[PDB]
Structures are given as C-alpha cells and as structure tokens.
C-alpha cells in the first residue's frame, strides 16, 4: 500500500527532485492540478487525488522526507517569500478558503466580518497570543 505508491513515484521523480528547486517543484505540481480541476469541471472525487498528493509530498519534504534523507542539514523551508507573504491577508485567505468548502449556505457578504467559525478561529488565535506572552 504505502511502499507501492512510494517506490513507484520515487523512481520517476528522483531525477527531477535532487536537481530542481523544491519551490519550483511544488509550483508546477500545483498549477497543473489546478488545471486538472478546470478540465474535469465530484468534489469527493477531487479530494481523492489531492489527498494522495498530500501524502507523497509529505513523504518527500516532510521530516525524514526523501529530500531530507538525500541532503543533511536543511532547516526545511521550500521557499523564502518577501513582501508578498508579509502583505497577504488572513481575511482574504479565509474567503478563498471558504469559496471551495462553503459552496452553498451563507453567502460571502461584505469584505471583513466573519461567519461563526471564522470568528472562533480568529478569537482563539487572538486569545492564545495574548496569554502566552504572560
């Protein structure tokens, strides 16, 4: 089960893993599946290929991933991002995140403002931040 999926994909991608920058390696694999979703369009059908993608990417760049096994050291980090990572908003990430999972139900409404869950995440995040500093 786990070995058949690993050894099969490892032997094919090993040549382009050690040489290619893991930042470009992910970006290509991501833009491709994004266009595989626009050709096919089932959402549970689409969770199946992505979830089998998540497991292999973990085998590859996760702890002890074939990458960390090939190269020692390596703090992690597949890309350093300037300005854009500092300028990306959580509220915008949530709305896009909700666009894929909400689907039907409460409409997006105006920018800012949250559903019940968004507020629970935002406050739990804001609460755990001010208490840990104590």
């Amino acid at each position: 089960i786990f070995d058949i999926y690993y050894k099969t994909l490892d032997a094919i991608f090993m040549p382009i893993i050690k040489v290619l920058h893991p930042a470009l390696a992910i970006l290509i694999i991501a833009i491709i599946v994004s266009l595989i979703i626009n050709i096919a369009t089932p959402m549970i059908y689409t969770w199946v290929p992505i979830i089998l993608i998540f497991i292999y990417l973990r085998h590859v760049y996760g702890f002890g991933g074939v990458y960390q096994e090939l190269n020692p050291g390596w703090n992690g980090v597949v890309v350093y991002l300037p300005i854009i990572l500092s300028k990306i908003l959580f509220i915008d990430f949530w709305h896009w995140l909700g666009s894929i999972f909400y689907k039907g139900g409460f409409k997006i409404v105006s920018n800012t403002a949250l559903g019940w869950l968004g507020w629970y995440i935002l406050c739990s995040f804001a609460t755990s931040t001010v208490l840990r500093k104590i």
Partner: antibody, heavy 128, light 108 residues
Amino acid sequence: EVQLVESGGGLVQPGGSLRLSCAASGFNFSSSSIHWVRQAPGKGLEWVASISPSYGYTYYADSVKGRFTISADTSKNTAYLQMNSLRAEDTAVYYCARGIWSYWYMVYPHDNYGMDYWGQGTLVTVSS
Amino acid sequence: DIQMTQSPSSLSASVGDRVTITCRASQSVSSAVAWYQQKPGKAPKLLIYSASSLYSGVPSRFSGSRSGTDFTLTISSLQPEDFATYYCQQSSSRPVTFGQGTKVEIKR
C-alpha cells in the same frame, strides 16, 4: 564595500580542537553561500566545506568529514567552522570565501559556479 | 572522485607575450569552471567563471574557453601586474577540486 574576516587561528596541539569564525559584511548573508578553502604551506588550494545559510545545506570533503563541522548563524552574520581531532597535515591558511550566485540558482540550488570574494584567511598551525 | 590536471606547472613569459594555461577534467563536467589568480601571500581572486564568463572588474585582457573537457585560460597581452600563480577550479560536481597550479614569471 564587501569583506570577510576570518579569526580564531593559532598554534594547537595535535588531537585538540580549534574554532574559526567568518564575519561577513557588505552583502546578503542569508542568500549567498559560504565556503571554506584551505591552502597548505607552499601547496595549492583545497576545499574543506561549504554551506548555504537559510536553506541549511551542508557539504563536506572526504578529508575533513567527521572531524569538521560547518555552521552559520544568520542572526550574527557569521559562518563558523569547528575543527576536532586536528592533525599535523591540517596546518595551513584557511580562506573564507563567498560563493558567487547567478539566477540559475533559483531554478537549481547546489551549483557553485565559483567563488566571488575570498577573505585573506587565517593561519592555523598544528604541532607539538 | 573528479581530478583536474592543469598544465603546465610553471612557465616564464615576457611583457606583451601570450600565455596559455590548460585545465583538463577527469570526466564529463558542465560548463561551470573558474580561473583564479593568486598573488604571493594573498587571497585568490576570481578571473573567469562558467569557463567563458569574465568576472566584473577583470580586464578584457583575460579570457577563458572550453574545448570538450579541456578548459583553457588565455592572456592576450601579458602585463606586469598579471604575474602570479593561476588555479583552475571545477564547480560542476562535488567534491570541488582545484588544479595543481601554474606559476607565471617574468623573463629578463
């Protein structure tokens, strides 16, 4: 307005240990790779170890492998070279060198292409 | 392991002459090779990288070339400040390896 300052050289008994530091200034330490290259007295250049801060890759030579540990502190803007089980043949001047970087790095990491800037090095003598 | 055999070991030229140094790789390597100039008691400096790319500040009097596995450094018109030992490095594979060195001297 760039430079690298090695330090920590001196006489050491065989089987001891010494620790060299490379203080860099004038360029981006987080990006450019750092390299250690030693030159035995009267001989040519020899490659000891290379490291890439940020990504944290470590590259050692079969000569110093196991006795030498290279590291870099991004917050201090310095690259350290730890030397254990020093032997008589390791005596030489130790140059700290910055790798030279081309945009092809972005597509491919791990490519040296050369050394751009070399510190004047620090002398290390191992003898009783 | 890769070895780089550089020749000749030493040579005596004169001002205005044309010097040629050859660095032969042991096996197939990329076009990424560097040529270094080292004055006596000084740190090595970079002249040519990628075999053919001239490094900034280095006068056009210097130049590299790639013939198969034989990389070559060429000083068109030798100058008084160009006298020193020259090394050739292959950075296309690990471990990195340098050349034995070429010692250039004036003739009088």
